[PDB]
Amino acid sequence: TPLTVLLRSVLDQLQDKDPARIFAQPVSLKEVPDYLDHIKHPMDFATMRKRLEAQGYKNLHEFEEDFDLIIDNCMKYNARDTVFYRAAVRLRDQGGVVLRQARREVDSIGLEEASGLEHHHHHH
């Protein structure tokens, strides 16, 4: 469907803002045993991918909410002076540009035309 196509393109670009794959898979309790003491709703790109594949996002807003979980959880759990926190800040800022442009396109030119534009932009 057009919505899956749009969200797939957006998710691919969001992951490009995470080149070291810090957010690509769930945080492991084996490596981070106290994670769930601070984070109640873990989220990661692979989990968003699965939800996408199954048409589990009603619209862009629900998709943004999952992206926000990835960001907010990382800035909550990890202290400011860490590699994880800084990577979350870059993903928040760089991905926010992507998300606001995608919403802007859907609202102005329609979902199909936005999915077409998101599959290959001519500029950024």
Contact 109, 117 (CB under 8 A): yes
If one counts every other C-beta atom within 10 angstroms of the C-beta of residue 44, the result is 19
Token pair recorded at residue 13 = 């670009």
Residue type, 42: P
Report the distance separating Cα 44 and Cα 54, nearest Å.
Answer: 16
Q: Say how far apart CA 114 and CA 71 lie, in whole Å.
A: 25
Q: In the chain, how many domains are there?
A: 1
Alpha carbon 39 to its chain centroid, in Å, reads 17
Can you give the CATH number for the domain in which 100 is found?
1.20.920.10
Task: Report the first-to-last Cα separation within the chain, whole angstroms.
Answer: 25
Which segments of 1-124 does DSSP mark as H helices, in order? 2-16, 35-38, 45-53, 60-77, 83-109, 111-119
Domain that holds residue 68: 1-124
* 124 alpha carbon, distance to own chain's centre: 18
> How many angstroms separate the CA atoms of 117 and 124, rounded?
11
**What was the elucidation method?**
X-ray
Residues ≥6 apart with Cβ < 8 Å to 32: 77
